[PDB]
């Protein structure tokens, strides 16, 4: 019946998502409505900046992407997926898209600012999380993938760099640049080397199960302080991943090792998340026995770690990046390519 209650929530959620999926919001703001303060991160085609909405005084995080660069690297479809998916989803552990627009030069997405910083920063500094602390975060991702996959979405870039910590210590998943709505298999070689499932590396055509593999990698990295497969160059990482050989730190609880053995299963018919029982194989595993899944969804559970921040606009949980002036050309670049954005 708990299982039925989740089944009901998902059907409702799917109806909401499809309305926005089929009729996406367009052009709901303008650049000169925002004051640009500081860069919080970068990516291949641009950056995310803290901004202040001038008429409300609210702070947001604005992704700016350069259209020409996107087109040069043939990443049009993926950037169009990012915005289309992000505007349609609604979940407590997904970052909220507030506005989007474009001009002659750039694409813009204005999201909720998540001031606690990236999980990556905290994990590197502290070293590793204790199993209860990792479990807390893992549970939020389990539910988030349960949500996303019911919508036929695959996320494909789970890593601590894309998990922001909010003021209450919960996760907000960001950076949907490889998210894709797909009913069957797909083939793009994409993602972050350390987190790539074997079937992606092997050019096999793959599905949602790549997200469950990636969750395995994440939980390991959270609890070990390093990922299961690492080396100085990508090619050596790929070799380790396809070999199907994982060593666990001596301090891992036997329940944690057993989970990871099922998530880091090279064999897709054996991988937790890809079985007839679906996500329930994961939620019912012994490592999660103390997890109250609904309390997590509702956010009544007490976060093991709450980031400090002196007020809105505070960026102290973020690294410093070099700033660059945003130039907007007088001539429209790549109009047809981005017409739906």
């Amino acid at each position: 019946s708990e299982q039925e209650s989740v089944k009901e929530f998902l059907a409702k959620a799917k109806e909401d998502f499809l309305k926005k999926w089929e009729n996406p919001a367009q052009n709901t703001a303008h650049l000169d409505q925002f004051e640009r303060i500081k860069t919080l991160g970068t990516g291949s085609f641009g950056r995310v900046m803290l901004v202040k909405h001038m008429e409300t005084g609210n702070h947001y995080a604005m992704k700016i992407l350069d259209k020409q660069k996107v087109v040069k690297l043939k990443q049009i479809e993926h950037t169009l997926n990012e915005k289309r998916i992000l505007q349609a989803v609604n979940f407590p552990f997904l970052v909220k898209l507030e506005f989007s627009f474009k001009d002659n030069s750039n694409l813009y997405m204005v999201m909720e600012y998540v001031p606690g910083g990236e999980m990556f920063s905290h994990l590197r500094r502290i070293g590793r999380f204790s199993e209860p602390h990792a479990r807390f975060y893992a549970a939020q991702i389990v539910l988030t993938f349960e949500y996303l996959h019911s919508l036929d979405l695959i996320y494909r870039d789970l890593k601590p760099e894309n998990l922001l910590i909010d003021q209450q210590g919960y996760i907000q998943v960001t950076d949907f640049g490889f998210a894709k709505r797909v009913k069957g298999r797909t083939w793009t070689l994409c993602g972050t080397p350390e987190y790539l499932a074997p079937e992606i590396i092997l050019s096999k055509g793959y599905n949602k199960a790549v997200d469950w593999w990636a969750l395995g990698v994440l939980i390991y990295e959270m609890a070990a302080g390093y990922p299961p497969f690492f080396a100085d160059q990508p090619i050596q990482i790929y070799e380790k991943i396809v070999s199907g050989k994982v060593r666990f730190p001596s301090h891992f609880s036997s329940d944690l090792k057993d989970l990871l053995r099922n998530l880091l299963q090279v064999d897709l018919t054996k991988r937790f998340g890809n079985l007839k029982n679906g996500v329930n194989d994961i939620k019912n595993h012994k490592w999660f026995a103390t997890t109250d899944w609904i309390a997590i969804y509702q956010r009544k559970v007490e976060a093991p770690f709450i980031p400090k921040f002196k007020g809105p606009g505070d960026t102290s949980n973020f690294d410093d990046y070099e700033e660059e002036e945003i130039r907007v050309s007088i001539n429209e670049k790549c109009g047809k390519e981005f017409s739906e954005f």
């Binding site: 993926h78 490889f178 793009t188 070689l189 993602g191 972050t192 080397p193 390093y226 100085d232 990508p234």
Partner: peptide
Amino acid sequence: TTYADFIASGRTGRRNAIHD
């Protein structure tokens, strides 16, 4: 230790995605 090998590795910073 594996921790020490990770820390001396070239991949302890932010990791970029690859694409097609």
